[PDB]
C-alpha cells in the first residue's frame, strides 16, 4: 500500500515485420497474466520462434531481448490458420513465465525469465528517454510495417485466387495481374512505403475481374 | 514558440468490432496529415461507412462522434481485398479533412470538420479522466475484439477452404468441422471471450485434415 511492485517497461514478443507486440504494458502491477493468440507467417510453417522483448520501442531490434525459444510440431496449414496462444505470466516473485501453445495439438513450449533479468534502472531510464526521443521515427516504422503486411496479404491472397480461378480468368487480365504481383513482391523487399503502396494500387486497378470471379466462387 | 496548437484528444475512425482506430494521436502538433489503408468486412461489400471519432477510449461508442459518411461503388471482391485509403488532414486553421479513397476505382468521399467541432475543454478533461479511470475495462474490450476478429477470420476462411476442398474432405471430418463452425458462429454473436476461444480451439482440433488439403491445394 505504500509501495506497488510494477513493470518498469513493456513486455512482449517480436511479430511479422520485426515489430514489437506488447503482451504486458508498462507500469502494470504484479502478479499479472495476459494472453494473445498469434499464427504463422508462411504456408506449411512447422514452427514459430518466440522472441521475448522488454522495452517501449516499436522496432523489436530496438528493445532488450530477454530470450527466445521455438514451438515446433505445427501441422501443415495455410498461413494464418494455426492457433498459437502466447501467455506472459509474472508471479508474486516477479518471475516471468512465457508459454506458446499450439491449439490444434496442445503442444507447448516455455521460457522462464528471472526477476533480475532485463534492463537495470539506468538502462530503463535511457529506454524511456529513447522512446520519447524517437516517437516519430517509430510511428513511421509502425506505418511501414502495416503497409508491408497489407501488401503481403494482397500478394499472398491474389496468388491463391489466381490459382482457384484458372480458366475463368481472361488472358489479358492474368497477364496484368501477374506482372503486378511480381512488382509488388519486389517492392516488399524494400523499405520504401510509397513504392509498396504504388504496387498495391496497380494490382487493385488491374484485378477487378479476378475479384469478381473470386467473389462469385464463394458466393 | 511560446505556444503550439496541438490536438487535445486522439482522432480516428470506427473499425470492425466497434473499436476506435486512431489516425492522429493525442497531442500532435498541427498542421499534420496521416493515412492508413483499410478494407471491407464482408464479401461483395459495396460501401464502407467512415465514422469519425475524437477521444481516448477503445470502444468507439465511448468517444465523441464528429460525423460519418459513406464511400460506395466498391466493386465485388472477397472481403479484406478492397483498398480504402483513409486520410486525416488538419490544416493550419485547425480544420480536419477526412477522405476515403477506393484504390481500385479512385472514387473518393470526404467530410470536413470545423476547428470548433468536438469536445470542449471540460469534456476534454472528463475524457482524459474517464480513459485513465477505465484503462483496464478498455484493455479487456481490446482483447475481446481481437478474439472476435480472429474467430471471424477462422470461420470465414474455414468455410472457403471446405468449399475449395469438396470431395477431397472425408465425410467424418467435414461433419466435425461444420458442427464446429456453427458453434463458433453462434459464439461470435456473444460477448464471452472464453466461449469464442473454446469454439476456435474445437475447430482447430478437428480441422487438421482440411488444413493439409488447403495447404496442398496451393502448394
Amino acid at each position: 500500500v505504500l509501495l506497488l511492485d510494477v513493470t518498469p517497461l513493456s513486455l512482449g514478443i517480436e511479430t511479422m515485420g520485426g515489430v514489437m507486440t506488447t503482451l504486458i504494458a508498462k507500469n502494470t502491477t504484479i502478479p499479472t497474466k495476459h494472453s494473445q493468440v498469434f499464427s504463422t507467417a508462411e504456408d506449411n510453417q512447422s514452427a514459430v520462434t518466440i522472441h521475448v522483448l522488454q522495452g517501449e520501442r516499436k522496432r523489436a531490434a530496438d528493445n532488450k531481448s530477454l530470450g527466445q525459444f521455438n514451438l515446433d510440431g505445427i501441422n501443415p496449414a495455410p498461413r494464418g490458420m494455426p492457433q498459437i496462444e502466447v501467455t506472459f505470466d509474472i508471479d508474486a516473485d516477479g518471475i516471468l513465465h512465457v508459454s506458446a501453445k499450439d491449439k490444434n495439438s496442445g503442444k507447448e513450449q516455455k521460457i522462464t525469465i528471472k526477476a533480475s533479468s532485463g534492463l537495470n534502472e539506468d538502462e530503463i531510464q535511457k529506454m524511456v528517454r529513447d522512446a520519447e526521443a524517437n516517437a516519430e521515427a517509430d510511428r513511421k516504422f509502425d506505418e511501414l510495417v502495416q503497409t508491408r503486411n497489407q501488401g503481403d496479404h494482397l500478394l499472398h491472397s491474389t496468388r491463391k485466387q489466381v490459382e482457384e480461378a484458372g480458366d475463368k480468368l481472361p488472358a489479358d487480365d492474368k497477364t496484368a495481374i501477374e506482372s503486378a504481383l511480381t512488382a509488388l513482391e519486389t517492392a516488399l523487399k524494400g523499405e520504401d512505403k510509397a513504392a509498396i503502396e504504388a504496387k498495391m494500387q496497380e494490382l487493385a486497378q488491374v484485378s477487378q475481374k479476378l475479384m469478381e470471379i473470386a467473389q462469385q466462387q464463394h458466393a | 514558440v511560446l505556444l503550439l496548437d496541438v490536438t487535445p484528444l486522439s482522432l480516428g475512425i470506427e473499425t470492425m468490432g466497434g473499436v476506435m482506430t486512431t489516425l492522429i494521436a493525442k497531442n500532435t502538433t498541427i498542421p499534420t496529415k496521416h493515412s492508413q489503408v483499410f478494407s471491407t468486412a464482408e464479401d461483395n461489400q459495396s460501401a464502407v461507412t467512415i465514422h469519425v471519432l475524437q477521444g481516448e477510449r477503445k470502444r468507439a461508442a465511448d468517444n465523441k462522434s464528429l460525423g460519418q459518411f459513406n464511400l460506395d461503388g466498391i466493386n465485388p471482391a472477397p472481403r479484406g481485398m478492397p483498398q480504402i485509403e483513409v486520410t486525416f488532414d488538419i490544416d493550419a486553421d485547425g480544420i480536419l479533412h477526412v477522405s476515403a479513397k477506393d484504390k481500385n476505382s479512385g472514387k473518393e468521399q470526404k467530410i470536413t470538420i470545423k476547428a470548433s467541432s468536438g469536445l470542449n475543454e471540460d469534456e476534454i478533461q472528463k475524457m482524459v479522466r474517464d480513459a485513465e479511470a477505465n484503462a483496464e475495462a478498455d484493455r479487456k474490450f481490446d482483447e475481446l475484439v481481437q478474439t472476435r476478429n480472429q474467430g471471424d477470420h477462422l470461420l470465414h476462411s474455414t468455410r472457403k477452404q471446405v468449399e475449395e476442398a469438396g470431395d477431397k474432405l472425408p465425410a467424418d471430418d467435414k461433419t466435425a468441422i461444420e458442427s464446429a463452425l456453427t458453434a463458433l458462429e453462434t459464439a461470435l454473436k456473444g460477448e464471452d471471450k472464453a466461449a469464442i476461444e473454446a469454439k476456435m480451439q474445437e475447430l482447430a482440433q478437428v480441422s487438421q485434415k482440411l488444413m493439409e488439403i488447403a495447404q496442398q491445394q496451393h502448394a
Binding site: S39, T40, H51, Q68, N70 | -
Partner: peptide, 7 residues
C-alpha cells in the same frame, strides 16, 4: 490476427 516467423 498477428503472425510469427520460423527462426
Amino acid at each position: 490476427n498477428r503472425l510469427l516467423l520460423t527462426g
